[PDB]
């Protein structure tokens, strides 16, 4: 029937799975890393609606998992329980703002209409749940039912640390808050927790027991509509970044004039802020660069990462520039860039169909890391921009919605926005949150309205700023 192991698998697949459909690239569209040639898409032109409370349904399952532990290793699974709770609620609050925390399980069980905690309270509870998760794993033994990190306590301690530092960096606008102690807790975890040691520590989904990358040919007919953005192609060309050749394939209209696949000029970025009819004309005449073949014709594609070694190092770099920790910003930054380049190389065959004549070799990595154009200058805003831009580029097809969250938090990289095409109700910007699910005004109206009055003066609005963004 139902064992702790089987439930663990369920929860873990939930956190790491992707859809084999268009929705996979909705966050790439929001972050402006690509346009979509099939039709005018909401997430390309910045139209938000409501998000969901589906995440809370995992609470009952996590509790059953812990109650069901049949050996003496309850701390392992309880550690997982606390990690999954924090993670799921973290992402819901990132989407929407205040929501239930204290009363969430009671609400799921139908015992109450659950009060909404303030987002500050939510973030504090998330951080306390992660400290508990770290202490639980620390006093636990390896466990069964984990296909992502193999039930390895050492790996779970690193995943918990990694998420702790990600959550704390997302609280950067709240560095002054008296009670949240963001800088202080970030430094303490860096000194006392378990930092990742390599790309082997990534919490990710790898493809190809009998399962293919979400945009393989066998899973979708729609990957062909992807049009890589100027935000990738122009940044790559400007810095001689050979990752362009692994992200993209040549524009067919360039190949037809005799421009070769190894040439930088064969690749065309599409500005996703242009009127859709212009985008459609560029798509029909093949004046655009689509996905590299590794995403679409290569069964294992690349792992889809939630928590990674490169990522953690871009977080450490930003913390260093912000003065949260004492280490050298530039060294973290270059570790991060190197880690992403090695990640690509490790997960891509050395064949022309994938690298187009520019293989990622150790010499290419070493050369790129010392490119003058990407060096940190020691001017704070310029350095945060560089770290966030390299992080943006390294997170194409990765870390669902995180790029957009870092954009909200820092304003980087600056995205293409066109008043005459932007379909948000404010022309000049992206929306800053989703609305709450309709089910909350159907069954928990009073508590939801208290929260809407407190946060926004009463209206559930996509252009209002949640607390962590104020
Ligand atoms: Cl480990
Ligand atoms: Cl349009
Ligand atoms: Cl994103
Ligand atoms: Mg995506």
């Amino acid at each position: 029937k139902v064992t702790s192991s089987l439930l663990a698998t369920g929860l873990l697949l939930d956190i790491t799975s992707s859809s084999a459909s268009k929705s996979f690239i909705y966050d790439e569209l929001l972050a402006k890393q690509m346009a979509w040639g099939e039709s005018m898409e909401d997430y390309q032109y910045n139209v938000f609606g409501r998000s969901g409370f589906g995440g809370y349904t995992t609470l009952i399952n996590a509790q059953k998992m812990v109650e069901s532990v049949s050996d003496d290793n309850v701390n392992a699974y309880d550690g997982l329980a606390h990690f999954i709770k924090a993670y799921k609620i973290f992402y819901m609050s990132m989407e929407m703002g205040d929501l239930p925390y204290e009363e969430a399980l009671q609400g799921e069980l139908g015992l109450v209409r659950p009060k909404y905690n303030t987002q500050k309270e939510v973030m504090n509870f998330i951080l306390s749940d992660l400290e508990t998760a770290y202490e639980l794993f620390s006093t636990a033994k390896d466990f069964d039912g984990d296909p992502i990190l193999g039930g390895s306590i050492s790996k779970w301690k690193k995943a918990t640390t990694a998420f702790q530092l990600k959550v704390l960096m997302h609280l950067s606008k709240k560095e002054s808050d008296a009670d949240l102690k963001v800088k202080e807790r970030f430094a303490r975890i860096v000194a006392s927790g378990s930092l990742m040691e390599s790309n082997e520590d990534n919490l990710q989904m790898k493809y190809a027991a009998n399962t293919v990358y979400p945009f393989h040919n066998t899973n979708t007919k729609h990957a062909g509509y992807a049009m890589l953005s100027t935000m990738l192609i122009d940044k790559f060309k400007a810095t001689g970044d050979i990752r362009m050749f692994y992200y993209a394939k040549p524009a067919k209209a360039k190949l037809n004039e005799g421009v070769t696949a190894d040439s930088w000029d064969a690749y065309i970025g599409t500005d996703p802020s242009l009127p859709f009819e212009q985008i459609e004309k560029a798509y029909a005449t093949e004046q655009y660069s689509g996905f590299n073949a590794r995403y679409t014709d290569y069964p294992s594609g690349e792992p889809v990462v939630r928590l990674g070694y490169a990522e953690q190092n871009f977080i450490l770099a930003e913390a260093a520039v912000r003065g949260w920790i004492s280490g050298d910003a530039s060294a973290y930054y270059k570790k991060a860039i190197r880690a992403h380049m090695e990640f690509i190389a490790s997960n891509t065959p050395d064949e022309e169909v994938y690298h187009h004549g520019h293989p990622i070799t150790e010499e290419a990595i070493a050369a790129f890391l010392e490119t003058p154009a990407i060096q940190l200058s020691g001017e704070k805003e310029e350095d945060i921009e560089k770290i966030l831009t390299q992080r943006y580029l390294a997170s194409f097809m990765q870390h669902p919605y995180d790029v957009y969250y870092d954009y909200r938090r820092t304003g980087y990289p600056v995205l293409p926005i066109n008043p005459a095409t932007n379909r948000n109700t404010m022309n000049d910007r992206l929306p800053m949150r989703w609305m709450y699910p309709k089910s909350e005004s159907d069954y928990n109206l009073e508590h939801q309205n208290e929260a809407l009055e407190r946060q926004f003066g009463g209206v559930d609005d996509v252009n209002k700023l949640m607390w962590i963004l104020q």
Side-chain angles (χ1 to χ4, degrees), residues 2-187 189-209 211-220 222-470:
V2 188
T3 61
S4 299
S5 191
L6 285 165
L7 291 160
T9 302
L11 295 164
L12 282 160
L13 298 172
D14 182 74
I15 286 301
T16 63
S17 70
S18 301
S19 187
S21 75
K22 214 206 277 179
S23 59
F24 193 48
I25 55 66
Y26 284 173
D27 63 317
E28 273 68 41
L29 293 178
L30 180 56
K32 306 291 166 280
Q33 291 180 323
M34 33 169 276
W36 192 254
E38 177 188 36
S39 49
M40 186 162 198
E41 291 287 317
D42 285 337
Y43 278 115
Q44 181 165 339
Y45 296 86
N46 312 307
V47 172
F48 271 32
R50 306 173 177 269
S51 196
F53 267 24
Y56 287 110
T57 65
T58 61
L59 300 183
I60 179 41
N61 296 341
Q63 178 200 251
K64 286 180 112 75
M65 183 180 61
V66 171
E67 287 165 336
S68 299
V69 162
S70 55
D71 60 19
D72 66 348
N73 199 20
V74 59
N75 286 359
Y77 291 103
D78 196 8
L80 184 62
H82 285 82
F83 173 100
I84 297 285
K85 184 173 180 212
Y87 193 94
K88 309 239 72 195
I89 300 164
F90 176 76
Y91 279 103
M92 283 181 300
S93 185
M94 289 290 279
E95 297 162 3
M96 287 171 290
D98 297 9
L99 35 63
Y101 202 100
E102 286 181 272
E103 301 185 350
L105 178 62
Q106 285 167 332
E108 291 305 285
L109 289 167
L111 299 180
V112 310
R113 299 204 269 258
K115 72 158 180 42
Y116 284 46
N117 285 110
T118 69
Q119 186 174 54
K120 170 168 165 154
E121 280 162 358
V122 169
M123 295 291 153
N124 214 302
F125 285 133
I126 282 162
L127 291 164
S128 306
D129 269 350
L130 289 166
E131 292 172 14
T132 302
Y134 190 85
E135 180 66 15
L136 282 156
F137 284 131
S138 289
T139 55
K141 301 291 188 191
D142 288 2
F143 63 99
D144 298 326
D146 172 17
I148 297 306
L149 292 178
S152 162
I153 292 303
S154 189
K155 297 271 190 210
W156 276 107
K157 286 172 66 171
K158 285 156 165 187
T160 302
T161 296
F163 193 53
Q164 289 170 296
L165 296 168
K166 185 148 124 184
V167 170
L168 286 156
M169 186 54 62
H170 276 299
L171 301 169
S172 58
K173 300 197 89 170
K174 308 277 111 185
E175 53 91 24
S176 315
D177 191 275
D179 301 298
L180 233 50
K181 284 179 175 40
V182 172
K183 300 189 275 52
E184 301 93 323
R185 291 199 270 193
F186 185 105
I189 289 154
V190 170
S192 78
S194 301
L195 298 170
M196 287 181 166
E197 287 174 298
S198 83
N199 289 339
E200 293 291 276
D201 297 338
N202 291 3
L203 201 161
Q204 61 192 6
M205 179 64 85
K206 303 247 273 176
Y207 291 94
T211 57
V212 302
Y213 183 81
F215 264 20
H216 198 250
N217 292 315
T218 57
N219 275 323
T220 176
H222 286 205
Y225 291 120
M227 295 165 91
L228 274 59
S229 183
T230 40
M231 290 291 292
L232 300 183
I233 299 315
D234 303 356
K235 288 188 197 307
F236 284 150
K237 288 179 179 193
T239 57
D241 192 338
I242 60 160
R243 292 175 286 188
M244 187 186 77
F245 294 104
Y246 279 84
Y247 279 18
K249 70 191 160 75
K252 176 75 190 143
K254 288 288 180 179
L255 294 184
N256 294 341
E257 309 313 293
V259 187
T260 62
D262 66 292
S263 163
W264 297 87
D265 184 52
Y267 300 76
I268 301 184
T270 299
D271 173 354
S273 75
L274 284 173
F276 185 67
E277 72 185 347
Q278 291 176 40
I279 296 276
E280 194 152 50
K281 279 151 169 79
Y283 182 81
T285 64
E286 305 182 275
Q287 294 178 101
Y288 76 93
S289 284
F291 281 122
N292 183 276
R294 71 201 190 88
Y295 296 105
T296 59
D297 310 335
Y298 180 57
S300 63
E302 65 177 2
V304 172
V305 183
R306 302 298 159 149
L307 297 167
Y309 184 59
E311 169 191 54
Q312 173 161 102
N313 281 280
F314 290 121
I315 289 169
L316 295 172
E318 181 177 358
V321 172
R322 289 189 185 285
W324 295 11
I325 57 179
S326 62
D328 185 63
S330 268
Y332 289 130
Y333 178 66
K334 298 173 185 176
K335 270 197 178 175
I337 301 163
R338 164 178 288 282
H340 180 244
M341 292 187 72
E342 295 178 349
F343 176 86
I344 299 178
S346 290
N347 293 284
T348 311
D350 180 10
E351 291 175 22
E352 184 285 348
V353 74
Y354 306 129
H355 61 48
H356 298 112
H358 308 260
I360 294 159
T361 61
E362 176 46 38
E363 96 172 299
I365 293 171
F368 182 71
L369 293 172
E370 299 299 324
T371 302
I374 72 173
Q375 303 304 300
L376 299 189
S377 64
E379 295 191 291
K380 166 155 157 163
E381 280 303 310
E382 186 180 358
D383 283 358
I384 292 165
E385 185 167 46
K386 281 173 180 168
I387 297 162
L388 265 90
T389 301
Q390 286 301 323
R391 195 175 170 181
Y392 175 99
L393 297 162
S395 193
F396 181 59
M397 310 290 280
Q398 301 296 339
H399 301 290
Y401 298 88
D402 281 347
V403 176
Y404 162 73
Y405 295 140
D406 284 319
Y407 171 73
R408 293 195 308 204
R409 182 177 64 85
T410 67
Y412 302 121
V414 174
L415 302 182
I417 292 172
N418 178 341
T421 70
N422 181 4
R423 283 163 71 88
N424 187 32
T425 49
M426 297 180 187
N427 291 319
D428 66 336
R429 66 191 76 186
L430 277 61
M432 284 299 110
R433 56 179 296 272
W434 288 269
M435 291 170 304
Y436 291 107
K438 192 71 188 70
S439 56
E440 287 293 297
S441 48
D442 298 332
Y443 305 110
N444 197 19
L445 182 61
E446 189 182 47
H447 287 151
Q448 186 205 54
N449 278 344
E450 289 174 9
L452 290 166
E453 193 63 49
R454 182 169 64 208
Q455 295 176 99
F456 308 128
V459 192
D460 201 358
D461 182 280
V462 301
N463 299 303
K464 288 286 200 176
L465 296 179
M466 62 186 44
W467 178 80
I468 61 172
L469 299 175
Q470 297 178 317

